[PDB]
Amino acid sequence: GLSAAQRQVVASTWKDIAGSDNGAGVGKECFTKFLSAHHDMAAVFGFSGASDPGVADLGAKVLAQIGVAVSHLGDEGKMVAEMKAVGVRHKGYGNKHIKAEYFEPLGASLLSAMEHRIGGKMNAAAKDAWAAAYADISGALISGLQS
């Protein structure tokens, strides 16, 4: 699971990529590749491919969640309180599908995008900490997900 160092290496890489945009250019470029490589979900998000500005609307709003979740990682006292609520919302979306199997990929593929901003600071302890933490952030959302 998350370690004492990874949990810290997470808040150290989120205070640079998000900064003020909170990951605005991290979700629009992350979900974009996901929607494309994943056409079965492109219709679930509400786009016609990886060329719709709507993606930046979801990723930008999704990245923020991970940001608020990066300040807790193991702290599931409140972090899961909001994330768990997201799942309860996804289960009541329009596609009526959503799967945690897609979360991992959308999470791992996200790290490949993070390097875009802190490409000079994204070190091994940074991509491995967010790769293991993304499982707890997106995983905690699977609590209220899947009605």
Q: Which residues contact 32 (CB under 8 A, 6 or more apart)?
A: 50, 55, 56, 59
Single out the segment in contact with ligand HEM by CB under 6 A; choices: 2-10, 16-24, 71-79, 133-141: 133-141
Contact flag: residue 25 with ligand HEM (CB under 6 A)? no
Q: What is the b/e burial string over 9-28, where b = at least 16 CB atoms within 10 angstroms of the residue's CB?
A: bbebbbeebbeeebbbbbbb
- Interaction pattern, residues 37-76, with ligand HEM; x per rule: CB under 6 A: ----x--xxx-----------x--xx--xx----------
Angle at 37 between CA 125 and CA 6, to 5 degrees: 15
In this chain, which residue has its C-beta nearest to ligand HEM? 102
C-beta atoms surrounding 40 within 10 Å: 11
Taking the complex as a whole, how short is the minimal distance between the CB of residue 120 and ligand HEM, in angstroms?
25
For 4, 34, 113, 146, the CA distances from 23, given in Å and listed in that order, are: 24, 16, 10, 26
- Choose, by CB under 6 A, the member of 26, 30, 70, 86 that binds ligand HEM: 86
Residue numbers in the known binding site for heme b are 90
Instruction: By CB under 6 A, name the binding residues for ligand HEM.
Output: 41, 44-46, 58, 61-62, 65-66, 86, 90, 93, 95, 98, 102-103, 106, 137-138, 141
Residue numbers in the known binding site are 90
